[PDB]
Design a protein around this motif. Structure first.
Motif, PDB file in Angstrom:
ATOM      1  N   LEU B 242       0.824  -1.202   0.000  1.00 40.45           N
ATOM      2  CA  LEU B 242       0.000   0.000   0.000  1.00 40.45           C
ATOM      3  C   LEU B 242       0.861   1.256   0.000  1.00 40.45           C
ATOM      4  CD1 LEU B 242      -3.288   0.386   1.961  1.00 40.45           C
ATOM      5  CD2 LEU B 242      -1.693   2.282   2.087  1.00 40.45           C
ATOM      6  N   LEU B 246       3.270   0.457  -6.309  1.00 37.48           N
ATOM      7  CA  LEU B 246       2.810   1.184  -7.494  1.00 37.48           C
ATOM      8  C   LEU B 246       2.979   0.406  -8.799  1.00 37.48           C
ATOM      9  CD1 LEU B 246       3.554   3.664  -5.378  1.00 37.48           C
ATOM     10  CD2 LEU B 246       3.757   5.000  -7.475  1.00 37.48           C
ATOM     11  N   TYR B 247       3.654  -0.744  -8.793  1.00 37.19           N
ATOM     12  CA  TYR B 247       3.788  -1.592  -9.975  1.00 37.19           C
ATOM     13  C   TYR B 247       2.590  -2.526 -10.013  1.00 37.19           C
ATOM     14  CZ  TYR B 247       5.933  -4.784  -6.514  1.00 37.19           C
ATOM     15  OH  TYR B 247       6.208  -5.543  -5.401  1.00 37.19           O
ATOM     16  N   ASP B 248       2.081  -2.792 -11.208  1.00 34.57           N
ATOM     17  CA  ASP B 248       0.835  -3.524 -11.343  1.00 34.57           C
ATOM     18  C   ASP B 248       0.971  -4.800 -12.158  1.00 34.57           C
ATOM     19  OD1 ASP B 248      -0.320  -1.549  -9.848  1.00 34.57           O
ATOM     20  OD2 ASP B 248      -1.072  -0.431 -11.579  1.00 34.57           O
ATOM     21  N   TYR B 274      -8.523  -3.241   1.148  1.00 35.42           N
ATOM     22  CA  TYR B 274      -7.145  -3.153   0.682  1.00 35.42           C
ATOM     23  C   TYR B 274      -7.090  -3.148  -0.842  1.00 35.42           C
ATOM     24  CZ  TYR B 274      -5.630  -3.908   5.491  1.00 35.42           C
ATOM     25  OH  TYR B 274      -5.406  -3.788   6.845  1.00 35.42           O
ATOM     26  N   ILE B 281      -6.884   4.134  -7.147  1.00 33.19           N
ATOM     27  CA  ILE B 281      -5.979   5.113  -7.728  1.00 33.19           C
ATOM     28  C   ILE B 281      -6.230   5.286  -9.224  1.00 33.19           C
ATOM     29  CG2 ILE B 281      -4.113   3.483  -8.186  1.00 33.19           C
ATOM     30  CD1 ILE B 281      -2.223   5.628  -6.899  1.00 33.19           C
ATOM     31  N   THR B 374       0.857  13.693  -0.935  1.00 28.76           N
ATOM     32  CA  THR B 374       1.067  13.823  -2.381  1.00 28.76           C
ATOM     33  C   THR B 374      -0.095  14.402  -3.187  1.00 28.76           C
ATOM     34  OG1 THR B 374       0.466  11.490  -2.869  1.00 28.76           O
ATOM     35  CG2 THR B 374       2.782  11.979  -2.357  1.00 28.76           C
ATOM     36  N   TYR B 375      -1.131  14.920  -2.511  1.00 28.58           N
ATOM     37  CA  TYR B 375      -2.265  15.672  -3.064  1.00 28.58           C
ATOM     38  C   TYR B 375      -2.920  15.106  -4.326  1.00 28.58           C
ATOM     39  CZ  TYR B 375       1.613  17.967  -5.758  1.00 28.58           C
ATOM     40  OH  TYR B 375       2.731  18.226  -6.522  1.00 28.58           O
ATOM     41  N   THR B 376      -3.027  13.778  -4.435  1.00 30.02           N
ATOM     42  CA  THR B 376      -3.337  13.164  -5.726  1.00 30.02           C
ATOM     43  C   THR B 376      -4.792  13.359  -6.130  1.00 30.02           C
ATOM     44  OG1 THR B 376      -3.811  11.051  -4.661  1.00 30.02           O
ATOM     45  CG2 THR B 376      -1.556  11.423  -5.440  1.00 30.02           C
ATOM     46  N   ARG B 380      -6.679  15.952  -8.663  1.00 36.51           N
ATOM     47  CA  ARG B 380      -7.637  15.620  -9.708  1.00 36.51           C
ATOM     48  C   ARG B 380      -8.974  16.286  -9.435  1.00 36.51           C
ATOM     49  NH1 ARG B 380      -5.618  10.410  -8.501  1.00 36.51           N
ATOM     50  NH2 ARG B 380      -4.132   9.612 -10.062  1.00 36.51           N
TER      51      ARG B 380
END
Lengths: 70, 488, 257, 187
Positions: B242, B246-248, B274, B281, B374-376, B380
């Motif tokens: 978590l 970031l890799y999928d 989870y 994202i 990180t204001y993601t 958006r």
């Protein structure tokens, strides 16, 4: 597990340690008008209330002046 | 001196009876329950042991017990040792060693006797016969007790407890895969171990050891598992994934396997939060909405309050993306209330969608939601404002003016009006008719429901899916009565 | 260590056939030099980070030659020295430059969902006040706007930083989708708005799109056909699959019985 | 070492195999870490296996055979563990080798029952390295026989000369014929 509730609750105790009973009493200033009133209605009343808390809150007093001007 | 001196030997003599009665009740209940046929009767102490764990998670156990109450620490199980037959004199010994500390006093200490906890696990844990279940039933409850208060150099003591745990059972095992009720216990027990010193792990270290082995222990079960404990071992992996993976190309859709019978009456909820957090994202609007709201609605047993602020907060965070943001309506608890006490002004600032004001409003009192990292999805949100507002325009009338509604959307040009409205048109979420007769842009804006508009094909799929859910619920009221009449 | 390598390194070479010999030469030298990151003895960070640097500028001439599988090759190999356990590796000044062209590559290949899940690692607050740190994500929030007018006015707002042509590679690779979505044509759209929205006076859109779309071009109008024209079903085949649903209702209601 | 490296994918997608081979070597260390990162390069591994252009069919078929049982069926892993040709592999207590000789033995005696009812005609081919790695671990048990499973597997393998070498070195020979027929009348 429910032991990962523990650091989230340490975050909660930090949130409650931000302001100590300043938001419970001050927000209880709104809750004492809002307690036992069904809060599904307080979301609609809070919705149009906060919508008109900026401008034209009552505004029915103004529509009689909107008659001749509009 | 008389105040605490008179009430000192009073209060204490009270958790002793419930903890000793508890360890004799679940210890002698577990061994005395599954002793003859452990393989026949399975998981009867599953809910018992977990409910004792959640029963002891709110222990106010040690507050004053650093001062001369530490006799409970060197004492332990001591049941039927040194010889498997002829345990009658040991039945005498059970009263004897408990009675020795009850004559006058005891020489006691806290931090000295930790490392020779392996004296009995070298020769005989309890009986030389039920060594696995008595070994984990002996060691595994008492390790969160002494390794409670993780701070103040007990992290190193936790490392000692780690290497003792692996060293006796979970380096590989004593017999690889026990294949009994304590194998099925040892799944979530070893998992619970790894969650417990996972705080030790993320405290200074990170992913780089037992977690990398836990894929090999994750597949050492042979695959023939029901994979409940395998899923719990997957949950620490995904929570490890978590904060930063970031890799999928592995865990996302690759980790996605058979989807076993993974129930626990908790693990649907937290497993699903989870995978909804990581599937949150890419801004999933259909799936993570309903199923993450479902995972909010799961786990009612212990609290519906203290943890579901996170699935709730993330939930409304992705709900205001779609233009329609339902607040806290039907649930009243002052934890989620204080959770949204910063969020309320901005989540009401969603719908009116005033650009220049609310752009200042977010960062203005932005402390913890913009310190959350990180204001993601708020970054958006900052250009999702005019899209949800123009979605409210889609909930309003058809024709687009060049002064009224263009000024109202704070957007004053002929080009950008039809251009960004056209960016809502390339979505497909709306119904609109691009027409230029004089230059004004129409839309048919038909929000007509399927009532007298192809109904058979419409709730066709509703009938099939709904009857499948209701009829698999009919299976779920067929088979557990088989699980009723099985014993009799 | 083994040789200097710095003679042709900073030498901006127009000819990359000369750089192919040096390039595969560095493949032959690094061929034994353990491409995977090695935490042994820890003074190998010199040659591993200089190996990183020569694969960075070799990736720069790999996009100067515009070689796509080589590009994901060198970026997938440079991630390995970017993503490593030791934080003792000093940050390249051109690291954020090359990661910014990586965001350019993600928006170029329309893998932009993996950009959006990649968006956690990048605001690590190394600089955050340089315009290139903020630039591809601001350009992508312009993409979520879809506003090309602010991008087109924003063409000369990038400084003498030499990747504005690479931004033009992006603009040239998104106009298929921008032009395709503006010519999605639900009802019909008229030519005179496509005068402004469609590009300059060279008629390449009405040339290429007459052979790409293959539609009808009317009297100074853009026509939209095959739009909501479909005749509804016979209800017979869905009555057969509903009959199969009734069969499976007799099954699932009464199988074990 | 690595976790999320995709440079190994691009090197596996690359010619001049003197860079492919140690890349596959370092892949075999990180395979239990990530089989699912290999799941996208499964196709290229299969392509460089099916041709005889690349020199090592078992460096390919070992990687594919160790990623398939992590991904899918034990049959498709089994076709490359058995289809890896000559494999120089010592007995190990590791999970991978014992699972592939496990499903190898299980599917081997599956074939032995499939052809035990067919003595003549349409006889299915059984590759000889299957017999080698079945009888290699089998005779490895038959160092001392362990006094039980020689006749047990020798009845499970449905094969003719598998049990005459068991009774050659056998202790308490009427115990082995009475134990034998005791198992045989119980099946």
């Amino acid at each position: 597990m429910s032991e990962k509730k523990q650091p989230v609750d340490l975050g909660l105790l930090e949130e409650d340690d931000e302001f100590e009973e300043f938001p419970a009493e001050d927000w209880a200033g709104l809750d004492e008008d809002e307690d036992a009133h069904v809060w599904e209605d307080n979301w609609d009343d809070d919705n149009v209330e906060d919508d008109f808390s900026n401008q034209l809150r009552a505004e029915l007093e103004k529509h009689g002046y909107k008659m001749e001007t509009s | 001196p008389p105040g605490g001196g008179e009430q000192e030997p009073p209060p204490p003599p009270a958790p002793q009876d419930v903890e000793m009665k508890e360890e004799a009740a679940t210890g002698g209940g577990s061994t005395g329950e599954a002793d003859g046929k452990t393989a026949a009767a399975a998981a009867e102490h599953s809910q018992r042991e977990l409910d004792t764990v959640t029963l002891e998670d709110i222990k106010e156990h040690v507050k004053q017990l650093e001062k001369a109450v530490s006799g409970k620490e060197p004492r332990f199980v001591l049941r039927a040792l040194r010889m498997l037959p002829s345990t009658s004199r040991r039945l005498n010994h059970y009263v004897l060693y408990k009675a020795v500390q009850g004559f006058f006093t005891s020489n006691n200490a806290t931090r000295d006797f930790l490392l020779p906890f392996l004296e009995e696990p070298m020769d005989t844990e309890a009986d030389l016969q039920f060594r696995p279940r008595t070994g984990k039933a002996a060691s595994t409850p008492l390790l969160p007790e002494v390794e409670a208060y993780l701070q103040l150099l007990v992290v190193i003591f936790m490392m000692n407890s780690k290497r003792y745990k692996e060293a006796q059972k979970i380096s590989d095992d004593l017999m690889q895969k026990i294949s009994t009720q304590n194998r099925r216990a040892l799944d979530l027990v070893a998992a619970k171990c790894y969650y417990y010193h996972a705080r030790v792990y993320e405290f200074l270290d990170k992913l780089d050891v037992v977690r990398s082995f836990l894929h090999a222990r994750l597949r050492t079960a042979t695959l023939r598992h029901d994979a409940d404990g395998q899923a719990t071992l997957l949950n620490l992996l995904l929570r490890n994934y978590l904060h930063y993976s970031l890799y999928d190309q592995a865990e996302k859709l690759v980790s996605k396997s058979v989807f076993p019978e993974q129930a626990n009456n908790n693990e649907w909820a937290r497993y699903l939060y989870y995978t909804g957090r990581i599937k949150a994202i890419q801004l999933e609007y259909s799936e993570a909405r309903r199923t993450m709201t479902n995972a909010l609605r799961k786990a009612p047993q212990h609290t519906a309050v203290g943890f579901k602020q996170t699935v709730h907060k993330l939930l409304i965070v992705v709900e205001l993306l779609l233009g329609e943001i339902p607040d806290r309506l039907q649930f009243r608890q002052p934890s989620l209330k204080r959770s949204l006490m910063p969020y309320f002004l901005l989540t009401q600032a969603v719908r009116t969608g005033n650009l220049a004001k609310f752009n200042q409003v977010l960062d203005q009192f932005g402390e913890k939601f913009q310190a959350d990292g990180t204001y993601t999805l708020i970054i958006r949100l900052r250009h999702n404002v005019i899209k949800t507002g123009v979605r409210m325009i889609s909930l309003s009338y058809s024709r687009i003016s060049l002064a009224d509604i263009a000024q109202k959307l704070q957007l004053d040009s002929p080009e950008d009006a039809e251009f960004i409205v056209a960016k809502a048109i390339r979505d497909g979420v709306i119904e609109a008719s691009i027409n230029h007769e004089k230059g004004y842009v129409q839309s048919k804006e038909m929000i007509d429901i399927y009532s007298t508009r192809e109904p058979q094909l419409a709730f066709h799929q509703r009938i099939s899916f709904c009857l499948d859910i209701h009829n698999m619920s009919v299976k779920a009221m067929r088979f557990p009565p088989k699980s009723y009449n099985k014993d009799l | 260590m083994y040789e200097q390598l710095k003679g042709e390194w900073n030498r901006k070479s127009p000819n990359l056939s000369k750089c192919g010999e040096e390039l595969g030469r560095l493949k032959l030298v690094l061929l034994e030099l353990n491409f995977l990151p090695t935490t042994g003895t820890k003074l190998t960070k010199q040659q591993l980070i200089l190996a990183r640097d020569i694969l960075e500028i070799g990736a720069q001439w790999s996009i100067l030659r515009k070689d796509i599988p080589s590009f994901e090759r060198y970026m997938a190999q440079l991630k390995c020295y970017y993503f490593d356990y030791k934080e003792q590796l000093p940050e390249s000044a051109y690291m954020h430059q090359l990661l910014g062209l990586n965001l350019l590559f993600l928006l170029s290949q329309n893998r932009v969902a993996e950009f959006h899940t990649e968006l956690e690692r990048l605001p690590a607050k190394d600089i955050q006040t340089n315009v290139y740190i903020k630039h591809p994500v601001s350009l992508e929030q312009y993409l979520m706007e879809g506003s090309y007018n602010k991008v087109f006015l924003a063409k000369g707002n990038i400084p003498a930083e030499s990747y504005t042509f690479f931004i033009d590679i992006l603009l040239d690779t998104i106009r298929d989708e921008i032009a395709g979505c503006i010519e999605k044509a639900y009802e019909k759209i008229l030519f005179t708005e496509a005068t402004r929205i469609l590009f300059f006076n060279t008629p390449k859109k009405m040339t290429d799109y007459a052979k790409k779309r293959g539609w009808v071009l009317g009297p100074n109008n853009y026509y939209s056909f095959a739009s909501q024209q479909q005749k509804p079903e016979d209800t017979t085949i869905p009555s057969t699959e509903l009959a199969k649903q009734v069969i499976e209702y007799a099954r699932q209601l009464e199988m074990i019985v | 070492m690595i976790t999320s490296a995709a440079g190994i994918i691009s090197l596996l997608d690359e010619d001049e195999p003197q860079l492919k081979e140690f890349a596959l070597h370092k892949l075999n260390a990180v395979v239990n870490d990530f089989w699912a990162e290999i799941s996208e390069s499964v196709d290229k591994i299969e392509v460089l296996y099916e041709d005889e252009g690349f020199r090592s069919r078992q460096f390919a078929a070992l990687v594919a055979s160790k990623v398939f049982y992590h991904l899918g069926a034990f049959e498709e892993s089994l076709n490359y563990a058995l289809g890896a040709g000559d494999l120089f592999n010592v007995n190990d207590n590791s999970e991978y080798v014992e699972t592939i000789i496990a499903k190898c033995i299980d599917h081997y005696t599956k074939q032995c029952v499939e052809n035990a009812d067919l003595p003549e005609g349409e006889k299915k081919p059984i590759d000889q390295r299957l017999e080698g790695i079945v009888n290699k671990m089998f005779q490895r048990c038959l160092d001392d026989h362990k006094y039980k499973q020689a006749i047990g597997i020798a009845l499970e393998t449905r094969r003719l000369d598998v049990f005459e070498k068991t009774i050659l070195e056998s202790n308490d020979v009427p115990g082995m014929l009475a134990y034998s027929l005791k198992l045989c009348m119980s099946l």
